[PDB]
């Protein structure tokens, strides 16, 4: 399964650790994504990183890259960039709170969490990760947008973020 | 009890300059000896939408039992989500009282004013600046004659108990 | 009940970077599901830590393949479970539940971007002196490790403010 849930009853939702690409940004299996969401009271503590492995991911054409995990209003996964687009518990306990992070609110500052990091861990390549909560007009979502450098390989190091949950 | 928060809301709940001029989110969740905290602050009325100063500070102060004494919230809404208060207070050995100036009492966050990439700002979260009891202080950079809004951010500190 | 590995909060130097007890380190790791939430800060107290000779400073905690601590910069290696989190004498715990995942953060992988977590902060909290903390997972070729490297300013005191980071665990 692409996203899997693990007990403390479910306390972790993650992409299982892998040594191989598990994600499709531009072409199939072109990248290795880690995404892990763990519940701590009203918070989800999230970690994310994304390593380019093949194709355009190793020779970027654009100055940013975005992916999104979208869920319906019950918290069921609808879509993700994962090669294994599947899921295998109260899902709303992991969804971003829709009162605080209003649906369709990507333009609202409080729906966005900004992280400074460095492309490929190179300090001469500062980039910014924007994590957005509930950009989707219905249901729930988590969006990740990183800046990038054209004609260079993409890799975003380990990062983390936190949001308040729906339940 | 794992969470202390101001409950999620979409209407103003906070008073920085005038009553109910802003929407504050502050949530503290306990994970062992840590509190994981999140905060954001959105201006909605008055000077918060047309700033007069280039920084904005708010503070939550608590007594030596962990009871809230003062905050900028319009109503007494900082509460247990629907208990030992000291398990949520910043550790007073590591973060000495009256320690606003001590580096280890301060936690820095980089963000962007109104999420605008031309407006990088710093948030300084300070533990136990108060001379007695406990405190959490937040100070953000701002730009005069512009609206203030600080995006979602987070921080982490070690607890007293 | 055991959720925390730490060096205890103290007001006295507890750490040796260049000379014995020259610094005050805080390091605390708390488990939340498949994550560790970590906090760290480092304050120079004496000697070269108050008058730096180099432009970066690094310390490392190494562990064996069971998660047992092998080396650290702490005087007497005072890094263990938080007292009072269990009523049992000599409480047991799964140390691998605190170790950085070795599939995601491969051993000897310090050159791999996903093994590194970058934090911006300010030297001595002076906002004119931005510095970068690099936390590296499993740099060591064997066992597990957490490495911390801060940039520094020569001929000045070193102190890094409160910071935090997060990684996925082995178990
Ligand atoms: C003397 O100038 C400074 C410094 O060292 O650069 C300015 C800096 O903003 C300040 N840090 C904070 C968090 O206030 C620091 C501490 O007060 C001092 O290091 C404590 O000993 O003093
Ligand atoms: C070629 O130089 C660089 C790069 O890519 O810019 C420098 C950068 O500091 C380094 N990152 C780290 C964490 O060391 C990176 C990786 O080692 C390499 O990309 C992995 O394949 O190599
Ligand atoms: N120096 C502080 C107290 C000790 C500290 O902050 O470390 C004060 O003058 O209140």
Author numbering:
A (entry chain C): 170 to 177, 193 to 272, 285 to 363
B (entry chain B): 194 to 275, 285 to 363
C (entry chain A): 193 to 363
Give me lines lifted from the publication on this model.
Most HAdVs are equipped with twelve protruding fiber proteins that mediate attachment to host cell receptor molecules. Unlike most other HAdVs, this virus contains two different fiber proteins, a long and a short one, a feature shared only with the two members of species HAdV-F (HAdV-40 and -41). We find that the long fiber binds to a protein-based receptor known as the coxsackievirus and adenovirus receptor (CAR), and that the short fiber binds to glycoproteins that contain sialic acid-capped glycans. Similar to all other known AdV fiber knob structures the 52SFK has a nine-stranded antiparallel β-sandwich fold and forms a stable trimer in solution.
In order to define the interactions of the HAdV-52 fiber with sialic acid, we solved the crystal structure of 52SFK in complex with 2-O-methyl-sialic acid (a stereochemically uniform analogue of sialic acid) at a resolution of 1.65 Å. The three shallow sialic acid binding sites of 52SFK are formed at the contact site of two neighboring monomers by the EG and GH loops at the side of the short fiber knob domain. Two of the three binding sites are partially blocked by crystal contacts, and therefore the structure contains only one fully occupied sialic acid, while a second sialic acid is visible with partial occupancy in one of the two partially blocked binding sites. The bound 2-O-methyl-sialic acid is well defined by electron density and engages the 52SFK mainly through contacts between the sugar’s carboxylate group and the side chains of R316 and N318. The bidentate salt bridge formed by R316 is a prominent binding motif among glycan binding viruses. In addition, the backbone carbonyl oxygens of R316, G317, and G303 form hydrogen bonds with the sialic acid O4, N-acetyl and glycerol-like functions, respectively. The tripeptide R316-G317-N318 located on the GH loop forms a hook-shaped motif (RGN motif) that is contributing most of the interactions, and that therefore largely defines the specificity of SFK52 for sialic acid. Mutating either R316 or N318 to alanine, replacing the R316 side chain with a negatively charged glutamate, or introducing a steric clash (and a polar clash, introducing a charge) at position 308 (N308E) all abolished the attachment of 52SFK to Pro-5 and A549 cells. The sugar’s O2 function, to which additional sugars would be attached in a glycan chain, is pointing away from the protein and towards the tip of the knob, suggesting that more complex glycan receptors that bind the knob with their sialic acid caps would have to face towards the capsid in order to be bound by the virus. The mode of interaction between 52SFK and its sialylated receptors is fundamentally different, both in location on the protein and in contacts formed to the ligand, from the known interactions between HAdV-37 fiber knob and sialic acid.
